[PDB]
Amino acid sequence: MVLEATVLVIDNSEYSRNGDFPRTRFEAQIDSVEFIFQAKRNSNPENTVGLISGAGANPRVLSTFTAEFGKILAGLHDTQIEGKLHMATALQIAQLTLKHRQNKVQHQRIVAFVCSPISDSRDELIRLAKTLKKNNVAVDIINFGEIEQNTELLDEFIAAVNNPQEETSHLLTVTPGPRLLYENIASSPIILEEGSS
């Protein structure tokens, strides 16, 4: 792919531990965070990824942009397993992280695993929508948590963010069955995806 800066967002809600993916969803996530980091690098090696949590009851910046998985690993193992995803804070935090980098000629991406339905205000969601369009930030959300009993509030906004543009923003929906979580992300486009230009 192209030289890309990504914030990977990990949800540590209390639906992030559902038995849906073996063995537990939380162990499934350890394998996926590692898997995804790697997929991005092998595509084009000029990729970097930072790490922030969107949950724990608090969001926390673990890691800024790095080409070493050892830091990203280290931020992951320090977690507190209960939280609640604050959708709004993750988008903002991610956007500020993307303004400062070691390379400032890179694509601006946010990928977020969403393991719970959102409890966020409706008004709040509308503001971030145009914040992503101002700064020309495109976001793929991997959802397998907000389809379990919830309907996608997020859909409209993610659509809106897309423009003709080498990045395409996408809502990626994953059937939440047993086949393991890194595998469904792999069989979803996320480095098999095409542009909007």
Binding site: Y15, R17, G19, D20, F26, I30, H77, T79, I81
Partner: protein, 388 residues
């Protein structure tokens, strides 16, 4: 597996209680485990009294031994063993679990990511002490408090759930020893850190309130009577019948009258033998309160024995004893003459600040500001040619 267990729970139970067993099984099939955890909570909230409560635990703990959060799981057992009428059985189950939690943490660490696991262990040791106390062993609980207290302090913080159980054990121990003073400190904290669960029955909260009121009537330096009636715990139970005359002993103390207090106490001393054994402390307590109060609302710093004797209904012989206990308790400071028969006060104890007293503070500060500003103007005119 879970299927055989589920049938056995339903049969021995009532028809009303079949759909409860059914809710759990459903979450299990879908594998939504946030919902499974909540639905166990509805169970132990108000049906910890059903004979099947303990077994129901035994299937879920095995599955979620290391899969979900340790605080969640442990919570069920504790509530189950608050409803056992046989405490020898209660002690055995804890002793096994205590043992499991010491093995578990090896495994469990790698699953969470990296986490604590002393959380369950602290709660288990409290339950061992509480079983002992309902069986009247004061000493076995006594070495468990010391060891348990130190581990609170070792961490930067203990959770509210964990610390309620620690303060739960302390309350139980103290009322047997009959120290009012000790019982008082544990209860005020228990209300602060009180769990948001409806799982702690209101019946316990009421009972705890009655004993609290009793601690402060017999207490030794408690002049927080107004303060006790502000907090929800007493405020709302004022119009209950047995907690009427009980709060009237609070209110009589406040206003410092002796007749409302006399008419009340002669009935309740006979009726309830608690007020009988601590009679010596109860009478003195009014006398002390009258003294402090007359001193605090006024701005003068001395009173003759003659003023004091009418106020407290004591002769000038006992009044000198009354003064000595007050200084000693830490209510007042001053000195005593018997050759001019004055008590000279020099210190008053800061008490509840009322809206009116803030205005009062302020007036004096305006007086002092002007004085400083005036002096500093003169001190500029002076020394005008000699400065750095």
């Amino acid at each position: 597996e879970i299927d055989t267990i589920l049938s056995t729970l339903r049969m021995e139970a009532d028809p009303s209680l079949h759909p409860l067993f059914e809710q759990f099984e459903k979450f299990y099939e879908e594998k939504l485990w946030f919902q499974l955890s909540e639905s166990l909570t509805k169970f132990f909230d108000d049906a910890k009294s059903t004979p099947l409560r303990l077994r129901l635990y035994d299937n879920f703990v095995s599955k979620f031994y290391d899969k979900i959060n340790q605080l969640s799981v442990v919570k069920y057992l504790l509530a189950s063993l608050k409803d056992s009428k046989d405490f020898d059985e209660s002690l055995k189950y804890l002793d096994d679990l205590k043992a499991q939690f010491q093995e578990l943490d090896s495994k469990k660490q790698r699953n969470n990511g990296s986490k604590d696991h002393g959380d369950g262990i602290l709660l288990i040791d409290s339950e061992i002490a509480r079983t002992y106390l309902l069986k009247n062993d004061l000493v076995k609980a006594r070495d468990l408090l010391d060891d348990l207290e130190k581990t609170l302090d070792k961490k930067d913080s203990i959770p509210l759930r964990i610390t309620n159980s620690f303060y739960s054990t302390n309350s139980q121990y103290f009322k047997f020893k009959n120290d009012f003073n000790s019982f008082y400190y544990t209860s005020l904290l228990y209300l602060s850190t009180l769990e948001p669960s409806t799982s702690i029955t209101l019946a316990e909260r009421q009972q705890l309130a009655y004993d609290l009121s009793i601690s402060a009537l017999l207490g030794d330096k408690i002049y927080n009577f107004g303060e006790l009636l502000h907090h929800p715990i007493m405020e709302t139970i004022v119009n209950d019948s047995n907690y009427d005359w009980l709060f009237q002993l609070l209110n009589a103390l406040t206003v410092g009258d002796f007749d409302k207090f006399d008419s009340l106490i002669k009935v309740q001393i006979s009726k309830i033998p608690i007020l009988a054994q601590h009679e010596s402390f109860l009478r003195q307590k009014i006398c002390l309160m009258t003294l402090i109060e007359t001193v605090f609302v006024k701005n003068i710093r001395m009173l003759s024995f003659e003023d004091i004797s009418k106020a407290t209904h004591l002769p000038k012989d006992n009044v000198e004893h009354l003064v000595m206990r007050a200084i000693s308790l830490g209510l007042l400071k001053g000195s005593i003459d018997q050759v001019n028969e004055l008590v000279t006060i020099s210190w008053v104890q800061p008490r509840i600040i009322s809206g009116d007293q803030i205005t009062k503070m302020k007036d004096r500060l305006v007086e002092w500001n002007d004085q400083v500003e005036k002096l500093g103007k003169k001190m500029e005119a002076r020394g005008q040619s000699i400065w750095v």
